[PDB]
Amino acid sequence: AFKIQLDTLGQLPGLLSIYTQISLLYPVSDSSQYPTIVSTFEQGLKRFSEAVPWVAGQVKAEGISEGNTGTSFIVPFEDVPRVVVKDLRDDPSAPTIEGMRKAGYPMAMFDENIIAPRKTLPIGPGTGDPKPVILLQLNFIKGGLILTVNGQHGAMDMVGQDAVIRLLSKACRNDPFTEEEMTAMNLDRKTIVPYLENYTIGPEVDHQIVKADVAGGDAVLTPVSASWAFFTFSPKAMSELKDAATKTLDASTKFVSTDDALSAFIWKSASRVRLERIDGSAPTEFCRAVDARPAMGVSNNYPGLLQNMTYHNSTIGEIANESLGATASRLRSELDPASMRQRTRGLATYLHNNPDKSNVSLTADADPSTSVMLSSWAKVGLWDYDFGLGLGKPETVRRPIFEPVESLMYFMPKKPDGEFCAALSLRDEDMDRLKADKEWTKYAQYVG
Ligand SMILES: CC1=C[C@@H]2O[C@@H]3[C@H](O)C[C@](C)([C@@]2(CO)[C@H](O)C1=O)[C@]31CO1
Numbered sequence: 260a261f262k263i264q265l266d267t268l269g270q271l272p273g274l275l276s277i278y279t280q281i282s283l284l285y286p287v288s289d290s291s292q293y294p295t296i297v298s299t300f301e302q303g304l305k306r307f308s309e310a311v312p313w314v315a316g317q318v319k320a321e322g323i324s325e326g327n328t329g330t331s332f333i334v335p336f337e338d339v340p341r342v343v344v345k346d347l348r349d350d351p352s353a354p355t356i357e358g359m360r361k362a363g364y365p366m367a368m369f370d371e372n373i374i375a376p377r378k379t380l381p382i383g384p385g386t387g388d389p390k391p392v393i394l395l396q397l398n399f400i401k402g403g404l405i406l407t408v409n410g411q412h413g414a415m416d417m418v419g420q421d422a423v424i425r426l427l428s429k430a431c432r433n434d435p436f437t438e439e440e441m442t443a444m445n446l447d448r449k450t451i452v453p454y455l456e457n458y459t460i461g462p463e464v465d466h467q468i469v470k471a472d473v474a475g476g477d478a479v480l481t482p483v484s485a486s487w488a489f490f491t492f493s494p495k496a497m498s499e500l501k502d503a504a505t506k507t508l509d510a511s512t513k514f515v516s517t518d519d520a521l522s523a524f525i526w527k528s529a530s531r532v533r534l535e536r537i538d539g540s541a542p543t544e545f546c547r548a549v550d551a552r553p554a555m556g557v558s559n560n561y562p563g564l565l566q567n568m569t570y571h572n573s574t575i576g577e578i579a580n581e582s583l584g585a586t587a588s589r590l591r592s593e594l595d596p597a598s599m600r601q602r603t604r605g606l607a608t609y610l611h612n613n614p615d616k617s618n619v620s621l622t623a624d625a626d627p628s629t630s631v632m633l634s635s636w637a638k639v640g641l642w643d644y645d646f647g648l649g650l651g652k653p654e655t656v657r658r659p660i661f662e663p664v665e666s667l668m669y670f671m672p673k674k675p676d677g678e679f680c681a682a683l684s685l686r687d688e689d690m691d692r693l694k695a696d697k698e699w700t701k702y703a704q705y706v707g
């Protein structure tokens with residue numbers, strides 16, 4: 260038995276309600292291999308659960324009442340995490356490995372309804388019902404295997420989910436866990452962010468509390484037609500964007516990263532096409548997800564939810580028209596560790612002080628029409644894991660498609676050669692213009 264209070268940050272209503280999904284594709288040479296794939300995975304899940312029982316638990320809330328959104332804990336559920344095994348080899352609506360390869364692994368070929376064990380959003384059957392900490396699905400497709408992992412978002416951010424998956428891979432291989440891994444997996448969560456003393460409200464929580472007169476909130480489904488698409492950026496395209504940004508930096512900015520440069524290029528490209536439907540004076544906010552473990556001095560192997568955002572406010576015309584380096588400098592300027600730490604402590608403290616957490620959101624004031632809400636998974640280690648399956652490393656690592664959430668965006672785990680894959684969700688008007696935009700298509704290959 261275990262009763263592990265979630266990270267205070269994981270008590271955010273918008274995180275408690277969603278699952279983060281990721282899919283790994285492997286080629287499978289012969290259908291004779293599938294029974295061993297399954298048994299290897301089941302034995303790995305069993306070994307993992309024996310070492311760290313909470314990975315098989317569920318997230319459960321208690322103390323909910325009027326004006327009290329309660330407190331959630333990881334508590335026992337089943338003996339092992341649930342894996343669903345699904346044979347799609349003869350399903351004509353399923354993808355095939357050759358179809359994938361020919362289309363360049365599009366998001367539309369990773370349909371969460373077909374290849375994931377549970378939806379991202381709390382929509383449909385069984386989303387009212389236990390919330391398992393992690394759920395898995397093995398999908399047999401013609402010539403291949405799609406492994407999908409779902410993580411309960413209050414229990415883990417993608418850095419934490421990567422930590423968990425990485426240890427699952429070790430458990431499948433029957434490789435020992437290190438002492439540091441075991442320690443990180445068992446750190447107390449409710450104390451991992453030290454609170455601020457005598458804190459009511461401050462700039463730490465700017466852009467994170469919903470107000471009646473300000474548009475924003477969690478996973479806003481806009482009443483406009485929208486879609487998801489992947490765009491790939493070659494290692495050369497990425498280095499040319501980084502070069503272009505580096506040449507045009509603000510005087511206050513010594514350097515920017517590859518990630519900064521692409522995030523900036525997208526904000527600029529989005530703002531540029533949006534000029535076709537709104538005035539340049541229209542405000543625009545970039546909300547950028549940031550792993551807060553380094554600022555807090557926490558192990559990269561901590562499997563919980565320790566993430567914040569940085570916020571950047573300008574206007575559509577300014578962002579579109581300024582240099583790439585000006586825009587990348589905006590982003591880099593908010594990454595001082597001391598700042599991230601103070602802001603993160605402030606958010607955690609505000610949450611701790613307030614039984615009613617219903618107004619708190621990482622995108623509290625991000626207007627979907629003009630904003631960019633981006634989370635980069637570029638640094639996570641998913642391209643390296645083989646799960647003892649004998650299939651080699653993943654051929655691709657892609658997020659499943661789900662309902663369009665206007666202005667929400669992700670970077671996939673960076674391919675070892677340096678290729679980036681960006682998932683963009685935009686209203687049709689914006690998406691169509693972006694795809695036809697020469698400055699965009701110079702670097703971005705549309706995949707879908
Ligand atoms: C459905 C959905 C998932 C989201 O993904 C990334 C990150 O995992 C948290 C979130 C704040 C996030 C959480 O709400 C985002 O705003 C969202 O709507 C996000 C945009 O930064």
Ligand SMILES: [Mg+2]
Nearest residue numbers: 615616617618
């Ligand atoms: Mg409320």
Ligand code: NA
Nearest residue numbers: 436437438439
């Ligand atoms: Na050790």
